[PDB]
Amino acid sequence: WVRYEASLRQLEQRQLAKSVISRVQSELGNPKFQEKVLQQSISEIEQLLSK
Amino acid sequence: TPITGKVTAVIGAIVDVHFEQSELPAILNALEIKTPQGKLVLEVAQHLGENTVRTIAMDGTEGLVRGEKVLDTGGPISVPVGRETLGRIINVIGEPIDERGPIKSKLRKPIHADPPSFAEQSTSAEILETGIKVVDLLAPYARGGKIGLFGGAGVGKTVFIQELINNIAKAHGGFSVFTGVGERTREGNDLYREMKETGVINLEGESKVALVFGQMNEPPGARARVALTGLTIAEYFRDEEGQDVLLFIDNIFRFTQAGSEVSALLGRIPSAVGYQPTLATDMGLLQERITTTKKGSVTSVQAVYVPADDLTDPAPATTFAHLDATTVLSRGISELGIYPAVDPLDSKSRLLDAAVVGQEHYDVASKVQETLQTYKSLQDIIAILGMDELSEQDKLTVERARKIQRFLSQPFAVAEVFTGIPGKLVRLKDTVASFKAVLEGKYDNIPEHAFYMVGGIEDVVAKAEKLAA
Amino acid sequence: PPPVRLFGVEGTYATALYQAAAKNSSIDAAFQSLQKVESTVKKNPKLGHLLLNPALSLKDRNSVIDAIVETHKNLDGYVVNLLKVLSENNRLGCFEKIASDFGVLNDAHNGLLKGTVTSAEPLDPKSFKRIEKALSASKLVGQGKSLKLENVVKPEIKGGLIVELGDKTVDLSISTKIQKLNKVLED
Amino acid sequence: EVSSILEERIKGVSDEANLNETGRVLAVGDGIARVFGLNNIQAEELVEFSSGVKGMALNLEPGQVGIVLFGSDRLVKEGELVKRTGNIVDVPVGPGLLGRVVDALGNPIDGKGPIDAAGRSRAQVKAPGILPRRSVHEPVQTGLKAVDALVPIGRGQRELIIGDRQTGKTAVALDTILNQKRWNNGSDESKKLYCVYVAVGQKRSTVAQLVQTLEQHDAMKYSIIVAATASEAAPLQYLAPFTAASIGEWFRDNGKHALIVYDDLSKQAVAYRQLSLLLRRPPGREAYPGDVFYLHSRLLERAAKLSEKEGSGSLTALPVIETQGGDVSAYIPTNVISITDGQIFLEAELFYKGIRPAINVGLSVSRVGSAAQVKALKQVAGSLKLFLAQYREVAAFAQSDLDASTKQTLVRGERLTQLLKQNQYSPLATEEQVPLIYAGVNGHLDGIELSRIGEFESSFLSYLKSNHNELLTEIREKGELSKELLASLKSATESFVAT
């Protein structure tokens, strides 16, 4: 019973793994792909000034 | 002024420095790179030009940030020597690894030194006796001699050496050097313990042995100059103290091996098998700095683990060149259960000359050699057929030889535990007598088993009585 | 010693040229003249770019050298010897290579730093300027060492940016962050 | 649950810092890459490529660094950005590696998630000096007669196990781990070995059978398995024994007794050969590079019985050498033999010819093994090696007529050899080995007809327990056979002989 319980958790995790891939393909579609480059830009501005 | 440089390259333990300064150290100079490990000792071995030397690194390599300050310590590494080297186990650097603290020294001497000249040498003729019967019969040692072994593994090498230390170093009273080149730490620990126990290292007092020990975990480059360090310590005794010394060196196959490793890295075209092109030169220096001179007589013992059991390999071949006497140790004879494992047809000594050991010894030895060679010759026939298909005359010879073979095994005191037989040291005079009798078949009438793994002829007789019960 | 150890790419030539002309303090002059002759070489394309292709004699190569110094007189003289040297050593393909190397060596001497800001697609000039300012302000750009930041376009870097200079980089791209995220959510 | 753990992990992604990173890959393939830059790099660093794979910098050269890819070349490619880990190769070491299969990157291939590990420690670490080293005193008991008797094995020692491939090669070692289940599941930590099984170059399937066996004998909890299978990349295989020994050293440097079995170092040689050749460094004898001696020797001497100062830790090495045809002069075997204390050469011919386990008594030695033996197993086993090397002699020349003295030895010898044999994957208790050896030595098994020897063993042991397990309890604690015990045992054994 414990063994299959662990197996179900692993199965859930790989199911949620392919859902992560699906979410990644969605993210890279959005012009959040464009807009977040601005976020990275300002973050790097803050970061590198903190260097 | 410290010759500043940067580490241009770190190709293995063959670091290359580029001395920024127009000052350039000479070849065989020594360098210290300051490390969080204290120092790293490197030794200039080539100048690769454009103010970039190429240096063997005599301490372990890793962590090195490519380009880092160097300072030139100059010249060969100068060890510290003295009579207070006795009672110290020292690293290649010279560190007291037995941690009896700083070695008091008057003279610190360069590791490299030039071999004494042809003229300066004094050539001995002294007999040294071990009390090992097989040694005595087949290859009499000489005091000041250069003795040689063709190793069993440690299973043979350590055992052979231990017996020699037990015999010769209690029959010697002068200085004695133990140099352990690329040997397992345990062997050293056992030896250290044993030496301390037999007071050879007296700690309350002073020793009469000094020790240099290089572990087989040591980096190849480090292993290369373990020998030279010992060679210097020996020179200090030989020359400066001006008394007879003793020396043990084992395993000098590792010296050869170490050289072969660094050579490739150095960039040298590696000669056949893989051995360094500089094999001859390195061997030459080493074996000409152990010479008996008018300054002193140093009995030396060199031990070469036979590479893959092939004696034809170039490293054993060049060993044969610098041995006053040799005692090749063979696995087959070990398998025959004979301890020592010495091949009896492959031992020779310069003092095997007939006159030197007297005609009677020589005649006895001659007959043993002839008999055994016949026996080996008929090993084929005996095996292909039986021993009952031998000619009757030969069959007698063969039976005698089978006895002679069994007789050669003598229990050894410092291995008495390992053999499980209390040891034996038998007189040379007795040995000659014993073989003489056997050759005349005097005691040939009692078990072959009686001859086997026991000492003298008298012991054989007694063991016949034991067997008879 | 000459700033930055180049070498090997016939950069021992560049090094040599630099140190020899550096004590003559005509390295900027050399570099400029070298640029001019290199440029008129590139701008000589019909078998002056295609006769950079090696197949010439020693002597014929030398006569090409004579034509090259015929093309202008405004050379360091150390670089007139450099032309001879390349002819003698029988290379001419590592001529722009040497030129480039000498340029790197030269602008190291000038102390001009070089950076790069690879991105997925070229970004705003306001962003370019903000990064240039930021980097110049930061300790990363040395004091009196002048950044020449190059935005480059590389589609392979999926989104974001990587700032590079002085062998110190921050890669906060979308691809790298995704990569790290994927790995961490596969554990 | 799964959501919470994933969410915790996602939260644990937080920002990248600036620092000296970035080299750019150029000439790559042949499992080494030549990277441009990496100007200040510690020697033997771990670098992680942005190909998501890590390599160990080997050659620091003027203007270039040559990484060696510790992992697949498939994902590495030209002009990739190599980022400095900035740290020399270290692997997590600690207490929580116990009962966890891990691969060579320390990734839990038991998949029980992140490993609990106290520290990380550099892959290469020098062996302790002469001064930290105390001569062996505690035995290791394998539970197999003759493998404790004839071959005496003791803690710290590098005690070689040499023999021929797939003669159930693994099994000899497995049995050792199993016998020491008794002691290791003990409460005395001086009687706790923590045993590490290094599986190099073995099929992942085979390892899975091994893992399953170990978990069947519930032995997983005192042992670690490190795995570098045959499929797994050769540079990873090269670093695989070294890493395992670091983990072992953490136990050793807790002063706690441990053991490490390196299966099979011969396959490390092939790996190092591959690596060397791909670094185009010149080959040595049998094409195995010249630094092969250095490779094995540096590895082996890290296994030791340290002194009281170091807390008397042990790390008993059992390295498993796979001889090609029983080529006992072969370069790799001889090199190993010279380093190792003793040999445990296993007689293949006899193995095939129904001696399981088959130990070539002649080619088994143990350099300092016999002073590890406890007095019971010195007294009872006294001269049995000699006796069976009289059996060795006797059967040598047996091949016509036999004198009664010879015949007596042969009858005992043949029967004694039968007694040595054990059922593969089922080792006996240490306590039990003492009477069995007592019986034969004291000549009680002289008369026992050959057919009933197996019966004699089981029945004798059952008899001893039923009649008086008191004797066995005494010998269990005393560990020395007193004169009274010896006589009592003679009497008791004779009593069993009668039945």
Coordinates of C-alpha atoms in Angstrom, one line a residue, chain B:
Chain B
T1 CA 65.7 39.2 -5.3
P2 CA 62.8 36.7 -5.8
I3 CA 62.4 35.9 -9.4
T4 CA 58.7 36.8 -10.0
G5 CA 56.8 34.9 -12.6
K6 CA 53.4 33.7 -13.4
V7 CA 52.2 30.2 -14.0
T8 CA 51.7 30.1 -17.8
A9 CA 50.6 26.5 -17.8
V10 CA 49.6 23.7 -15.5
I11 CA 49.8 20.6 -17.7
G12 CA 49.7 18.0 -14.9
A13 CA 52.4 18.3 -12.3
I14 CA 54.6 19.9 -14.9
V15 CA 53.7 23.5 -14.2
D16 CA 55.3 26.1 -16.5
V17 CA 56.2 29.5 -15.2
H18 CA 57.0 32.6 -17.1
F19 CA 59.4 34.7 -15.2
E20 CA 58.4 38.2 -15.9
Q21 CA 61.8 39.4 -14.7
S22 CA 64.6 39.2 -17.1
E23 CA 66.4 37.1 -14.4
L24 CA 66.0 33.5 -15.3
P25 CA 66.9 30.6 -12.9
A26 CA 69.1 27.8 -14.1
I27 CA 68.2 24.2 -14.6
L28 CA 67.6 22.2 -11.5
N29 CA 66.8 25.4 -9.6
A30 CA 64.0 25.3 -7.1
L31 CA 61.0 27.5 -6.8
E32 CA 58.3 28.2 -4.2
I33 CA 54.8 29.1 -5.1
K34 CA 53.0 30.3 -2.1
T35 CA 49.8 28.3 -1.7
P36 CA 47.2 27.9 1.1
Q37 CA 49.0 24.6 1.5
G38 CA 51.9 26.7 2.6
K39 CA 54.2 26.3 -0.3
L40 CA 54.5 24.2 -3.4
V41 CA 58.0 23.2 -4.4
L42 CA 58.7 23.1 -8.1
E43 CA 62.0 22.4 -9.8
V44 CA 63.1 24.0 -13.1
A45 CA 63.9 21.2 -15.6
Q46 CA 63.8 22.8 -19.0
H47 CA 64.0 26.3 -20.1
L48 CA 61.4 26.5 -22.9
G49 CA 62.7 30.0 -23.9
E50 CA 61.1 33.4 -24.1
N51 CA 61.5 33.6 -20.3
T52 CA 59.2 30.6 -19.8
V53 CA 60.7 27.8 -17.9
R54 CA 59.1 24.4 -17.6
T55 CA 59.1 23.0 -14.1
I56 CA 58.5 19.6 -12.5
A57 CA 56.2 20.1 -9.5
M58 CA 57.5 18.2 -6.5
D59 CA 54.4 18.6 -4.4
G60 CA 50.8 17.9 -5.4
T61 CA 48.9 20.0 -8.0
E62 CA 45.4 21.3 -7.9
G63 CA 43.8 24.6 -7.0
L64 CA 46.4 26.5 -9.0
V65 CA 45.1 29.7 -10.5
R66 CA 46.8 29.9 -13.9
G67 CA 49.1 32.9 -13.5
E68 CA 50.3 33.2 -9.9
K69 CA 53.3 34.6 -8.3
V70 CA 56.5 32.6 -8.1
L71 CA 59.7 33.3 -6.3
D72 CA 63.0 31.6 -7.1
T73 CA 64.5 29.7 -4.2
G74 CA 67.4 28.9 -6.5
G75 CA 69.5 25.8 -7.0
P76 CA 68.7 22.2 -6.1
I77 CA 66.5 21.6 -3.1
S78 CA 68.8 21.5 -0.1
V79 CA 67.9 19.0 2.4
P80 CA 69.1 19.2 6.0
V81 CA 71.6 16.6 7.1
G82 CA 73.5 15.9 10.2
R83 CA 73.8 13.0 12.7
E84 CA 70.5 14.3 14.0
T85 CA 69.0 13.0 10.8
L86 CA 69.2 9.7 12.6
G87 CA 65.9 9.3 14.4
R88 CA 63.8 11.2 11.8
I89 CA 61.6 10.1 8.9
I90 CA 61.8 12.9 6.4
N91 CA 59.8 13.9 3.4
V92 CA 61.3 14.7 0.0
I93 CA 61.1 18.4 1.1
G94 CA 62.8 17.3 4.3
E95 CA 59.8 17.7 6.6
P96 CA 59.9 15.5 9.7
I97 CA 56.9 13.4 8.9
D98 CA 57.4 11.5 12.1
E99 CA 57.0 14.9 13.7
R100 CA 59.9 14.7 16.1
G101 CA 60.2 18.4 15.2
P102 CA 63.0 20.3 13.4
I103 CA 66.0 18.3 12.2
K104 CA 69.1 19.9 13.6
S105 CA 71.5 20.3 10.8
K106 CA 74.9 21.8 10.2
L107 CA 75.0 21.4 6.5
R108 CA 72.0 21.5 4.2
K109 CA 73.0 19.8 1.0
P110 CA 71.7 20.0 -2.6
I111 CA 69.6 17.0 -3.8
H112 CA 71.6 16.9 -7.1
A113 CA 75.3 16.1 -6.9
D114 CA 77.8 14.9 -9.4
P115 CA 78.7 11.1 -9.2
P116 CA 82.2 10.5 -7.8
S117 CA 85.0 10.2 -10.3
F118 CA 86.5 7.0 -11.6
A119 CA 89.8 7.8 -9.8
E120 CA 88.2 8.5 -6.4
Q121 CA 86.5 5.1 -6.2
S122 CA 87.9 2.3 -4.0
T123 CA 86.7 -1.1 -5.0
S124 CA 86.0 -3.6 -2.2
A125 CA 86.3 -7.3 -2.0
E126 CA 84.9 -7.9 1.5
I127 CA 82.4 -10.7 1.9
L128 CA 79.1 -10.0 3.6
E129 CA 77.2 -12.9 4.9
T130 CA 73.5 -12.8 5.4
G131 CA 72.9 -16.2 7.0
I132 CA 70.3 -16.9 4.3
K133 CA 71.5 -20.2 3.0
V134 CA 70.4 -19.7 -0.6
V135 CA 72.1 -16.3 -0.7
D136 CA 75.2 -17.7 0.7
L137 CA 75.4 -20.6 -1.7
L138 CA 74.4 -19.0 -4.9
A139 CA 75.4 -15.4 -4.7
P140 CA 77.7 -14.3 -1.8
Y141 CA 77.1 -10.7 -0.9
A142 CA 80.0 -8.2 -0.4
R143 CA 80.3 -5.5 2.2
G144 CA 79.8 -2.1 0.5
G145 CA 78.1 -4.1 -2.2
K146 CA 75.1 -3.3 -4.4
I147 CA 72.5 -5.9 -4.0
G148 CA 69.5 -6.4 -6.2
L149 CA 66.1 -8.0 -6.1
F150 CA 63.5 -8.6 -8.8
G151 CA 60.5 -8.2 -6.6
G152 CA 57.6 -10.6 -5.6
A153 CA 55.2 -7.8 -4.9
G154 CA 55.8 -6.9 -1.3
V155 CA 54.7 -10.4 -0.6
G156 CA 58.2 -11.1 -1.8
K157 CA 59.7 -7.7 -1.7
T158 CA 58.9 -6.7 1.8
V159 CA 59.6 -10.1 3.2
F160 CA 63.0 -10.3 1.6
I161 CA 63.9 -6.9 2.7
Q162 CA 62.7 -7.5 6.3
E163 CA 65.0 -10.5 6.6
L164 CA 67.9 -8.4 5.3
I165 CA 67.2 -5.6 7.8
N166 CA 67.1 -8.1 10.6
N167 CA 70.3 -9.8 9.6
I168 CA 72.5 -7.2 8.0
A169 CA 71.5 -4.2 10.2
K170 CA 72.2 -6.0 13.4
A171 CA 75.5 -7.2 11.8
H172 CA 76.2 -3.5 11.0
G173 CA 76.9 -1.0 13.6
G174 CA 77.5 2.1 11.4
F175 CA 75.0 4.4 9.9
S176 CA 72.1 2.9 8.0
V177 CA 69.6 4.5 5.6
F178 CA 66.2 3.2 4.8
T179 CA 64.8 4.8 1.7
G180 CA 61.3 3.8 0.8
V181 CA 60.4 5.0 -2.6
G182 CA 56.7 4.7 -3.5
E183 CA 55.8 2.1 -0.9
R184 CA 52.6 1.6 0.9
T185 CA 52.1 3.5 4.1
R186 CA 51.4 0.4 6.1
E187 CA 54.7 -1.2 5.2
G188 CA 56.3 2.0 6.6
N189 CA 54.2 2.0 9.7
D190 CA 55.1 -1.6 10.4
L191 CA 58.7 -1.0 9.8
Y192 CA 58.7 2.2 11.9
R193 CA 57.1 0.3 14.7
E194 CA 59.4 -2.6 14.3
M195 CA 62.5 -0.4 14.2
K196 CA 61.4 1.5 17.2
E197 CA 60.8 -1.8 19.0
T198 CA 64.2 -3.3 18.2
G199 CA 65.7 0.0 19.3
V200 CA 67.3 0.5 15.9
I201 CA 65.3 3.7 16.2
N202 CA 66.0 4.4 19.9
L203 CA 63.9 7.4 20.8
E204 CA 65.1 7.7 24.3
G205 CA 68.5 7.6 22.8
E206 CA 69.4 8.0 19.2
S207 CA 69.0 5.6 16.4
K208 CA 71.6 4.2 14.1
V209 CA 69.2 4.2 11.2
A210 CA 67.7 7.2 9.4
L211 CA 64.7 6.9 7.3
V212 CA 63.4 8.6 4.2
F213 CA 59.9 7.5 3.2
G214 CA 57.9 8.3 0.2
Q215 CA 54.4 6.9 -0.1
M216 CA 53.0 5.4 -3.2
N217 CA 50.2 7.9 -3.0
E218 CA 52.8 10.7 -3.6
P219 CA 52.5 12.6 -6.9
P220 CA 54.7 11.1 -9.6
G221 CA 57.0 14.1 -9.7
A222 CA 57.5 13.9 -5.9
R223 CA 58.3 10.3 -6.2
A224 CA 61.1 11.0 -8.7
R225 CA 63.2 13.0 -6.2
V226 CA 62.5 10.8 -3.1
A227 CA 65.5 8.7 -4.2
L228 CA 67.8 11.7 -4.7
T229 CA 67.0 13.0 -1.2
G230 CA 68.1 9.7 0.3
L231 CA 71.1 9.7 -2.0
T232 CA 72.2 12.9 -0.4
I233 CA 71.7 11.7 3.2
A234 CA 73.8 8.7 2.3
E235 CA 76.4 11.0 0.8
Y236 CA 76.6 13.0 4.1
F237 CA 77.3 9.8 6.0
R238 CA 79.7 8.5 3.4
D239 CA 81.7 11.7 3.1
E240 CA 81.2 14.1 6.0
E241 CA 80.8 11.5 8.8
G242 CA 83.3 9.3 6.9
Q243 CA 82.0 6.0 8.3
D244 CA 80.6 2.9 6.6
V245 CA 76.8 3.2 6.1
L246 CA 74.1 0.8 4.9
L247 CA 71.3 1.6 2.6
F248 CA 68.1 0.1 1.5
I249 CA 66.2 1.4 -1.4
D250 CA 62.9 -0.2 -2.4
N251 CA 61.1 0.2 -4.7
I252 CA 63.3 1.7 -7.4
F253 CA 61.0 0.4 -10.1
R254 CA 58.8 3.2 -8.8
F255 CA 61.7 5.6 -9.5
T256 CA 61.9 4.4 -13.0
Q257 CA 58.2 4.5 -13.3
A258 CA 57.9 8.0 -12.0
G259 CA 60.4 9.1 -14.5
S260 CA 58.4 7.5 -17.3
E261 CA 55.3 9.4 -16.2
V262 CA 56.9 12.8 -16.1
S263 CA 58.8 12.4 -19.4
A264 CA 55.7 12.3 -21.5
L265 CA 54.2 15.3 -19.7
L266 CA 57.5 17.1 -20.1
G267 CA 57.1 16.6 -23.8
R268 CA 59.9 14.1 -24.4
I269 CA 59.2 11.5 -27.2
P270 CA 58.7 8.4 -25.0
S271 CA 60.9 5.5 -25.9
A272 CA 59.8 1.9 -26.3
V273 CA 57.2 0.3 -24.0
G274 CA 56.8 3.7 -22.6
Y275 CA 60.0 4.3 -20.8
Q276 CA 61.6 7.7 -20.7
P277 CA 64.3 8.4 -23.3
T278 CA 66.4 9.6 -20.3
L279 CA 66.2 6.2 -18.7
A280 CA 69.9 5.5 -19.1
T281 CA 71.1 8.9 -17.8
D282 CA 68.9 8.8 -14.7
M283 CA 69.9 5.3 -13.9
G284 CA 73.5 6.2 -14.4
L285 CA 73.5 9.1 -11.9
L286 CA 71.6 7.1 -9.3
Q287 CA 73.8 4.1 -9.4
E288 CA 77.0 6.0 -9.6
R289 CA 76.3 8.0 -6.4
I290 CA 76.0 4.8 -4.4
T291 CA 79.6 3.8 -5.2
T292 CA 82.1 2.6 -2.6
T293 CA 84.8 5.2 -2.5
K294 CA 87.9 5.8 -0.4
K295 CA 85.6 8.1 1.5
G296 CA 83.2 5.4 2.6
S297 CA 81.8 1.9 1.9
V298 CA 78.0 1.9 1.6
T299 CA 76.3 -1.4 1.3
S300 CA 73.3 -0.8 -0.8
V301 CA 70.2 -2.8 -1.5
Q302 CA 68.0 -2.0 -4.5
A303 CA 64.6 -3.6 -5.1
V304 CA 62.9 -3.6 -8.5
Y305 CA 59.3 -5.0 -8.8
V306 CA 59.5 -6.8 -12.1
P307 CA 57.2 -4.9 -14.5
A308 CA 54.5 -7.4 -15.3
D309 CA 56.9 -10.2 -14.4
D310 CA 58.9 -9.5 -17.6
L311 CA 62.6 -9.3 -16.9
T312 CA 63.2 -8.5 -20.6
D313 CA 61.5 -5.1 -20.1
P314 CA 64.0 -2.2 -20.4
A315 CA 63.7 -1.2 -16.8
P316 CA 65.0 -4.5 -15.5
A317 CA 67.5 -4.6 -18.3
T318 CA 69.1 -1.4 -17.2
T319 CA 69.0 -2.6 -13.6
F320 CA 71.1 -5.6 -14.4
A321 CA 73.8 -3.1 -15.5
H322 CA 74.4 -1.7 -12.0
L323 CA 74.4 -4.6 -9.7
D324 CA 77.4 -6.1 -7.9
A325 CA 75.3 -9.2 -7.2
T326 CA 71.7 -10.0 -8.1
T327 CA 69.1 -12.3 -6.7
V328 CA 66.2 -12.5 -9.1
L329 CA 63.1 -13.6 -7.2
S330 CA 60.6 -15.6 -9.2
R331 CA 56.9 -16.3 -8.7
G332 CA 57.3 -19.9 -9.9
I333 CA 59.7 -20.7 -7.1
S334 CA 57.3 -19.1 -4.7
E335 CA 54.6 -21.4 -6.1
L336 CA 57.0 -24.2 -5.5
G337 CA 56.6 -23.1 -1.9
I338 CA 60.3 -22.3 -1.5
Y339 CA 60.8 -19.3 0.6
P340 CA 63.0 -17.5 -0.5
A341 CA 61.6 -17.2 -4.0
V342 CA 65.0 -16.8 -5.5
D343 CA 65.5 -18.5 -8.9
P344 CA 68.5 -20.7 -8.3
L345 CA 69.7 -20.6 -11.8
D346 CA 69.2 -16.9 -11.9
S347 CA 71.5 -15.6 -9.2
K348 CA 75.0 -14.4 -9.7
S349 CA 77.5 -12.4 -7.7
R350 CA 80.8 -11.0 -8.6
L351 CA 82.1 -12.8 -5.5
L352 CA 80.8 -16.1 -6.9
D353 CA 84.4 -16.4 -8.2
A354 CA 85.9 -19.7 -7.2
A355 CA 89.0 -18.4 -5.4
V356 CA 87.0 -15.8 -3.5
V357 CA 84.8 -18.3 -1.6
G358 CA 87.4 -21.0 -1.9
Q359 CA 87.5 -24.0 -4.1
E360 CA 85.4 -26.1 -1.8
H361 CA 82.6 -23.6 -1.8
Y362 CA 82.8 -23.2 -5.5
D363 CA 82.9 -26.9 -6.2
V364 CA 79.9 -27.4 -4.1
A365 CA 78.1 -24.6 -5.8
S366 CA 79.1 -25.8 -9.3
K367 CA 77.7 -29.2 -8.5
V368 CA 74.4 -27.7 -7.2
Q369 CA 74.1 -25.7 -10.4
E370 CA 74.8 -28.5 -12.7
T371 CA 72.4 -30.8 -10.9
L372 CA 69.6 -28.3 -10.8
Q373 CA 70.1 -27.4 -14.4
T374 CA 69.8 -31.0 -15.4
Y375 CA 66.7 -31.2 -13.3
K376 CA 65.2 -28.3 -15.1
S377 CA 66.2 -29.8 -18.4
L378 CA 64.4 -32.9 -17.5
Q379 CA 61.4 -31.0 -16.2
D380 CA 60.0 -31.3 -19.7
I381 CA 60.6 -35.0 -20.0
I382 CA 59.4 -35.8 -16.5
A383 CA 56.2 -33.9 -17.2
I384 CA 55.6 -35.2 -20.7
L385 CA 56.1 -38.7 -19.6
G386 CA 56.7 -39.7 -16.0
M387 CA 59.8 -39.7 -13.8
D388 CA 59.9 -43.5 -14.1
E389 CA 60.6 -43.2 -17.8
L390 CA 63.9 -41.4 -16.9
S391 CA 67.2 -43.2 -17.4
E392 CA 68.2 -44.8 -14.2
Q393 CA 71.3 -42.7 -13.8
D394 CA 69.4 -39.6 -14.4
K395 CA 66.6 -40.7 -12.1
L396 CA 69.0 -40.8 -9.3
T397 CA 70.2 -37.3 -10.2
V398 CA 66.6 -36.1 -10.3
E399 CA 65.8 -37.6 -7.0
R400 CA 68.8 -35.9 -5.5
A401 CA 67.8 -32.6 -7.2
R402 CA 64.3 -32.9 -5.8
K403 CA 65.9 -33.1 -2.4
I404 CA 68.2 -30.2 -3.1
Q405 CA 65.2 -28.0 -4.1
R406 CA 63.4 -28.8 -0.9
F407 CA 66.5 -28.2 1.2
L408 CA 66.8 -24.7 -0.1
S409 CA 63.7 -23.6 1.9
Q410 CA 64.7 -22.2 5.2
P411 CA 62.3 -20.5 7.6
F412 CA 62.9 -16.8 8.2
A413 CA 62.9 -15.1 11.5
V414 CA 61.2 -11.8 10.5
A415 CA 58.4 -13.6 8.8
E416 CA 58.3 -16.4 11.4
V417 CA 54.7 -15.4 12.0
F418 CA 53.9 -15.4 8.3
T419 CA 55.6 -18.8 7.6
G420 CA 54.3 -20.0 10.9
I421 CA 57.6 -21.7 11.5
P422 CA 60.2 -20.3 14.0
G423 CA 63.0 -18.7 11.9
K424 CA 66.5 -20.0 11.2
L425 CA 69.8 -18.3 10.5
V426 CA 72.4 -20.8 9.4
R427 CA 76.2 -20.3 9.4
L428 CA 78.0 -20.0 6.0
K429 CA 80.5 -22.7 7.1
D430 CA 77.6 -24.9 8.0
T431 CA 75.9 -24.2 4.7
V432 CA 78.9 -25.4 2.6
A433 CA 79.1 -28.5 4.8
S434 CA 75.4 -29.2 4.5
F435 CA 75.3 -29.0 0.7
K436 CA 78.5 -31.0 0.4
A437 CA 77.0 -33.9 2.3
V438 CA 73.8 -33.7 0.3
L439 CA 75.7 -33.7 -3.0
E440 CA 77.4 -36.9 -1.8
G441 CA 74.0 -38.1 -0.8
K442 CA 75.0 -38.7 2.8
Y443 CA 71.6 -37.8 4.2
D444 CA 69.8 -38.9 1.0
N445 CA 67.9 -41.7 2.5
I446 CA 65.3 -39.8 4.5
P447 CA 62.1 -37.9 3.4
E448 CA 62.0 -35.1 0.9
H449 CA 59.4 -33.7 3.3
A450 CA 62.2 -33.6 6.0
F451 CA 64.3 -31.4 3.8
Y452 CA 61.4 -29.1 3.1
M453 CA 61.0 -25.7 4.9
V454 CA 63.5 -26.4 7.6
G455 CA 67.0 -25.0 8.3
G456 CA 70.3 -26.9 8.5
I457 CA 71.2 -30.5 7.8
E458 CA 71.1 -31.3 11.5
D459 CA 67.5 -30.0 11.5
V460 CA 66.7 -32.3 8.6
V461 CA 67.9 -35.3 10.6
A462 CA 65.9 -34.3 13.6
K463 CA 62.8 -33.7 11.5
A464 CA 63.3 -37.2 10.1
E465 CA 63.0 -38.4 13.7
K466 CA 59.9 -36.2 14.0
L467 CA 58.4 -37.8 10.9
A468 CA 59.4 -41.2 12.1
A469 CA 57.1 -40.7 15.0

